[PDB]
Design a binder for this molecule. Structure first.
Ligand SMILES: NC(=O)c1ccc[n+]([C@@H]2O[C@H](COP(=O)([O-])OP(=O)(O)OC[C@H]3O[C@@H](n4cnc5c(N)ncnc54)[C@H](O)[C@@H]3O)[C@@H](O)[C@H]2O)c1
Ligand SMILES: NC(=O)c1ccc[n+]([C@@H]2O[C@H](COP(=O)([O-])OP(=O)(O)OC[C@H]3O[C@@H](n4cnc5c(N)ncnc54)[C@H](O)[C@@H]3O)[C@@H](O)[C@H]2O)c1
Ligand SMILES: NC(=O)c1ccc[n+]([C@@H]2O[C@H](COP(=O)([O-])OP(=O)(O)OC[C@H]3O[C@@H](n4cnc5c(N)ncnc54)[C@H](O)[C@@H]3O)[C@@H](O)[C@H]2O)c1
Ligand SMILES: NC(=O)c1ccc[n+]([C@@H]2O[C@H](COP(=O)([O-])OP(=O)(O)OC[C@H]3O[C@@H](n4cnc5c(N)ncnc54)[C@H](O)[C@@H]3O)[C@@H](O)[C@H]2O)c1
Lengths: 332, 332, 323, 323
C-alpha cells in the first residue's frame, strides 16, 4: 500500500517534519501508563513516546494503546529503549524507579532512584535540551532537585508533581464532608510530598467564602482540629492504598494530566508543585518542595512567595529540614 | 427510505420512547442561541427544543443548528411555537423578553417581561410539571420570583442565572491583573444581578491562599480599594458592551452552559444563583437574589446561609430593598 | 465537626433523596474492569459509579485511588463492594469478571469457567437492576452474551456483547497507518466471532466517502488483527487499554442515546443461514434502549460463507455448555 | 495596586516572554467570524485568539464579551483590533470578512466585492505571519481561495478553503435522519463548488463500513443541500452556527495535526480533465503543515463529468476577475 497510495494521493509537502506537542513518558509501569492514558484522554500530544528498559512490556503496552487510536487524537504512539525516539520533546514525564513496599517511606527509595536518574536525565537532556522535565518518581522533592542538578536546566523547566495530588486528596476529603464537588472547596497542601506536608489552614475557602464565614462556630480551633484529622488521612492515604492494592496509579495519572494540561496549553494556572524554595520560610539550603506555581508553556513562569502564618512557615521550614536530612547524604 | 430501511434493519424495540435529557430553550434571540450553542457544545442534551413566537427566525435557527449535527452529540434538535414540543423537559431555560437599550436599567424591563412570563410559564408547567426552570431574562431576580409564583414549583426547581456571570466577570478582571487563569482566583458576587450587587471581600482567595496572605501590604483597606475599582467595572461591564455591540450573548451563553452542566450532570457544584433569601441578612420580604447554592439534578439541593461581615450583610440587605422597590409594583 | 456544622450552614430545599440518573456498574475490578471504569469516568458518563468484585481489599484500594482523583472528574459518587444492593437501579452494567487467556490460549477455552461465574453474577445483577442494559466484556464474549441473555431473561435489546467493536478499531488503525490518515476516516468492518474466526467485510471498505474502487493485503491485515491479542498477551500478559477505550465508546452511545452504529454481539439466528441461537458481531444501532436496530446486510458470497463458518465455530463450543 | 504588588508576591523564573504556540487569528467579527471564534474557543485550540475587523466599536464589544467568559475557557489571551501587528506569528488565520448573500443571490455574485477586500487583507496577513495557514471562509469560497493563493504567494498546502466540509455535513445529516442513525456513521461525500454545482459522490456512500450495495432519492437529498443556505438566508437572513462548527472541525485537524480527511478547496488542475487553475473541493489530508495530501479519486463517468461542469461554472466567473 505504501507503494500504491502513491497514485491516489498527491503529496503537496514532500517534507513531513517534527511534532509540535511531543510528549515522552519514561517508565511504562502502573504510574507511567496511567499518566500516558490520562495525557491521551486530554488530547495533549500529537506524538507520545514511551521509554523503559523492559523491551517486551514496552512493546505490549505500546501496542495496547496504539490499538485504541480510533478513539483518540494522538496520531503517533511509539515506544522503545533508545532515547533518540524522544528527540525534541516538549514535555518529559519521568515515572521510572522503585516504589514503596507496604509501610515503606518514600525517602527510602532515594538511593535506588538517584542511580536510575543518573542514567535517565543525561539521556533526556541529550535529545531534548529545551524540554520541560516533570518529575513524578519518589521521593519526588529530592529527585526534582537531582534532575535539576544533572540536567543543567533553568528552574522553570524542572518541575516535580509534588503536592498537586496531596491537595486534590485534601479537597476531596473536605468536600466529601460538606457534600459539594471538590472543585468548589479550596485548600492547598504544601511542603514535602510525604509525611511532613503542610496544610494551609489560613486559606480554606468554599466558592469565594472564607471557611470562617460559613458558621460562627468555625473558628481557628475548629479549623485546626478538622485539619489535624483530615491531614492525617491525607498523609496516610498512599500507605493504605499500597496495603490494599499494592500501589497507586489512577489519581496520580489524573494529577499529571492536570499539570500537563496547564503546561501544554499555556494556561497559567496555579499548582502546588516542587521547585526550589531556598530564600523562603527561613530555608537556606537548596531544598525543593511544593509551593504554588504558575504553569505554562515555559514551565514554571512564576513562583508565589506568600506571607503565611507563623505556624505554617515553621511547619514548612521543618518539612525542608526533613527533606535535607535525606538529601545531604546523596552523592552526585 | 423510511419505507426501504424496513428490510436492511431489524427493529428490536418497536417502542421508541422519550429522551432522558430533554432541554428546552425559550427565546431564539442572541442569548437563547448562545445558550443553546453552549448547551450543545457540552453535549448535555439528547433532545434540544427551541421555542419562540417568530416562526421564520425559529425555523432558520433550527435548521442552522441541525445542519451542524455531524459535529455534535444531540440527535434531536427541534423548534416551534407549540409548547407540546417541550413535554417532559428536564430543564427549561427562559431567555425571552425585552433587553436593555443603551443606558437602560435591567429593572426597566420588568413590566414588559412579567407580561411575557404570564404567558410562557403556565405553558411550560403544563407540559413539564417536573422540570427545572432556569431564568435568564432580565431583571433576572424579579422574574425568578415571578416564575416561582406563576409555576407553583418548589424552590429547588426555580433558579435564576443571577450572579454566576457577574462572578465570572469579577474573577476575570482580578486574575487579569495578577496574570493567572481565572479558575484559580476565587471571589464571588452576590445580591442583585445589577447595579446593587455585592462583592464578598472577606472571601477573596488564590488557589488556597487567602488574599491577605499574599503580601504584607494586602490589608483590609487595600482590598476595599481594589474591589471598589474592580466592582465598578463589573457593574458597568454590560452597559459598555451594549453601547459598543448592542447586546451581550457569549459570556452569558457560557455561564448558562456552566449552570446547566452542574444541573444535568448532578455535580453538586456551588454557584451564586438567584433564589429566595427571606430569612437571611435581615431580609423579610420574599426577595430572590444570588446566594451560593448547591446544584444538581433536583435543582438547588442546598442554599448556603453564611455569616458574612457586617458590611456585606448590610449591602445585601440594601440590594434586596432595591429589588423589592421595583418588585412591589408588579401585579400577579 | 464539619459533618454537624454543614447541617446548620446549609439549608436543604429538597428532603427527597432521589436516585442517580446515570448509575453505571462495573463487575470485576481486574485489569479490564478498571480500564473500563477509568475510561467511563474520563467520559463523564456516570453520576454514580459502582465497582463490584469478590476481593475486598483490592476493591477498596481501587475505589480509594479513583475517589482521590475526584477533583479532576465529574462523577460525584464512586463506591465499591461485594453486595449487589450497591448496584440497585443501574442504567448500565458492564461485566468484565472472569478467567482470561494464558499465552496462546483460545478465548473459547474460558467459557465453562466463566459460565459458572455468570451463573452467580447475572441473577444478582437482574435482582437489583431489572431494567438495566447489560454490556458483556468477559470472554468468550459472544457465548457469554448468549449466556447472559438466557440467565437474565432480558429482551435482546438490553443484552449486548462488546464483540468486534475492538477488532474493528484495530483493523481501522492498521489500515490507516499504511495510508497515513487518521483511523476515524477509514471505514472497515470486522464481524463475526470476537476471536480467530472473525470476518473482514472487504466489500464495505471506504475512505471518507470514497469506496476502495474509487481509489489481497487487506486479508493480511485481518490476520494481524486476529493475532493481536495473542501477541500482547505474550508481551504484556493481558490487554486492557484498548478494550477500556472501546467500552467507553460503546457506553457513550448507550448513555447519551446517540443512535450510533457499532459491531457488537447480538442474536444472528435468521441471518447468513444460521438456524442456531448464535450470537456474534453484526452492526447495531445503540442508544438508551440498548440495541434499537440490527443491520441485515447483503454481503458477498465469500463474506456470508465466512460468517456462517464463524457461527459454526462458536456453536461448536456453545452447544457443549450446561446452563 | 494589585499590578504593583504582583511584582513582589511572585518570583519570575523566566525573563523570556515567548510567543504563543497556537495563535489563531479570525479576520471579520461578523456573524460567521464570531461563530467561528466561539467554536474554536470551545475546542480549546488556541492559547491566543486575535480578532481583526474595521469597525472599532463592534470589535471591542465582541472582544469584551468573549473575554468575560474566560473563566469557562482555556484561552488565556483574547484580543481584538484593526492593526495586523496583533496577528503576528499566527499559526492559523481564518478569513471570514466580506459581503454575504442577500435572499436568492448566488455566492458567485459576491466575488468582485470580496476580491477587493482580500487585496487589502491577504498582504497584511502575510506581512506579519508569513508561515501561517490560511483558511478561507468568505464566499465564493472556491474562487477566493484561489485569490488568497495568488495574493499571498503561499504554497498550496497553506491555502485552504472551507469548501464542502459544510455541504458534506449537511448531506450526511439529511441522509442520517431518514435512516435513523447518527450522521457520523453515514459516509457521504459532496465535492466541487461550495454552491449550486456541487457533486454528490453517490458511488462512495457507506454506513459504518457497509457499502450501499451491501444494504434516485440521494439526488433529491443533494438538491435540499444546495438549497439549504438559500432557505436559511430567507428565514434568518444569514447562516452562522453550522459553518462555525465546520470551521472548528477543520481547525481541530490542522492545529492538532490529526491527518484527518476533509473535502476542502484546493487546486484541482490536472484532475477530471481540468486544465485551468480552478480550486474546488476534493478530499484532502489536514495537519499542522496544512494540506499534506490531496486525493486523486477515480469516480464514475457521471461524477467526473459533474465535477468538470462544476469547474467550468467556477471558471466562468473566475476568468472575469481582475487581480
Ligand atoms: N509523585 C507521586 O505522587 C507518586 C504517586 C505514585 C507513585 N509514585 C512513584 O512513581 C514511581 C513508579 O511507580 P510505579 O507504580 O509505576 O512502579 P512500577 O514498578 O509499576 O514501574 C516502574 C517502571 O520504571 C522502569 N524503570 C526502572 N528503571 C528504569 C530506567 N533506568 N529507565 C527507564 N525505565 C526504568 C521499570 O522498568 C518499570 O517499568 C515510583 O517511584 C513511585 O513511588 C509517585
Ligand atoms: N441574566 C443575564 O445575565 C443576561 C445577560 C444578557 C441578556 N439577558 C436578558 O436575556 C433576555 C433576552 O436578551 P436577547 O439579547 O436574547 O434579546 P433578543 O431580542 O435577541 O431575543 C429575545 C427573544 O425573545 C422572543 N420572545 C419575545 N416574547 C416571547 C414570548 N412570549 N414567548 C417566546 N419567545 C418570546 C423574541 O421573539 C426574541 O426572539 C433579555 O431580557 C436580556 O436582558 C440576561
Ligand atoms: N471482549 C474483549 O475484547 C476483551 C478484552 C480483554 C479481556 N477480555 C476478558 O475480560 C475478562 C477479564 O480480563 P482481566 O484482564 O480484567 O482479568 P483479571 O484477572 O485482571 O480480573 C478479573 C476479575 O474478575 C473478578 N471476579 C472473579 N469472579 C468474580 C465474581 N463472581 N464476581 C465478581 N468478580 C469476579 C476477579 O476477582 C478479578 O478481579 C476476561 O475474561 C478477558 O478474557 C475481553
Ligand atoms: N464558506 C461558507 O460555508 C460560508 C457560510 C456562511 C457565510 N459565508 C460567507 O462569510 C462571509 C461573512 O459572512 P457574515 O454573515 O459573517 O457577514 P457579516 O456582515 O455579518 O460580517 C462581515 C464582516 O466582514 C467585515 N469586513 C469588511 N471588510 C473588512 C476588511 N477589509 N477587513 C476586515 N474585516 C472586514 C465586516 O466589517 C464585517 O464585520 C460572507 O462572505 C459569507 O457569504 C461562507
Amino acid at each position: 500500500m505504501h507503494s500504491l497510495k502513491e497514485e491516489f494521493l498527491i503529496r503537496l509537502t514532500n517534507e513531513d517534519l517534527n511534532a509540535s506537542n511531543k510528549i515522552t513518558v519514561i517508565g511504562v509501569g502502573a504510574v507511567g501508563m496511567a499518566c500516558a492514558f490520562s495525557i491521551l484522554n486530554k488530547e495533549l500530544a500529537d506524538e507520545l513516546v514511551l521509554i523503559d528498559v523492559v523491551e517486551d512490556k514496552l512493546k505490549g503496552e505500546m501496542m495496547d494503546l496504539q490499538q485504541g487510536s480510533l478513539f483518540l487524537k494522538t496520531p503517533n504512539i511509539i515506544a522503545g529503549k533508545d532515547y533518540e525516539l524522544t528527540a525534541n520533546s516538549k514535555l518529559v514525564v519521568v515515572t521510572a524507579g522503585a516504589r514503596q513496599q507496604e509501610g515503606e517511606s518514600r525517602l527510602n527509595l532515594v538511593q535506588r532512584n538517584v542511580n536510575i536518574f543518573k542514567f535517565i536525565i543525561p539521556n533526556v537532556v541529550k535529545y531534548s535540551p529545551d524540554c520541560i522535565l516533570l518529575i513524578v518518581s519518589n521521593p519526588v522533592d529530592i529527585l526534582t532537585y537531582v534532575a535539576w542538578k544533572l540536567s543543567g536546566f533553568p528552574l522553570n523547566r524542572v518541575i516535580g508533581s509534588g503536592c498537586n495530588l496531596d491537595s486534590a486528596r485534601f479537597r476531596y476529603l473536605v468536600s466529601e464532608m460538606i457534600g459539594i464537588h471538590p472543585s468548589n472547596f479550596h485548600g492547598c497542601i504544601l511542603g514535602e510530598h510525604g509525611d511532613s506536608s503542610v496544610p494551609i489552614l489560613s486559606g480554606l475557602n468554599i466558592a469565594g467564602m472564607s471557611i470562617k464565614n460559613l458558621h460562627t462556630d468555625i473558628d481557628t480551633v475548629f479549623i485546626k482540629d478538622m485539619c489535624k484529622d483530615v491531614h492525617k488521612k491525607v498523609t496516610e492515604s498512599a500507605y493504605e492504598i499500597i496495603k490494599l492494592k499494592g500501589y497507586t496509579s489512577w489519581a496520580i495519572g489524573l494529577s499529571v494530566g492536570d499539570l500537563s494540561c496547564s503546561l501544554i496549553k499555556n494556561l497559567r494556572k496555579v499548582h502546588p508543585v516542587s521547585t526550589l524554595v531556598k530564600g523562603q520560610f527561613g530555608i537556606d539550603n537548596e531544598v525543593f518542595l511544593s509551593v504554588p506555581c504558575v504553569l505554562g508553556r515555559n514551565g514554571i513562569s512564576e513562583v508565589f512567595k506568600p506571607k503565611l502564618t507563623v505556624e505554617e512557615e515553621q511547619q514548612l521550614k521543618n518539612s525542608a529540614e526533613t527533606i535535607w536530612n535525606t538529601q545531604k547524604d546523596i552523592q552526585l
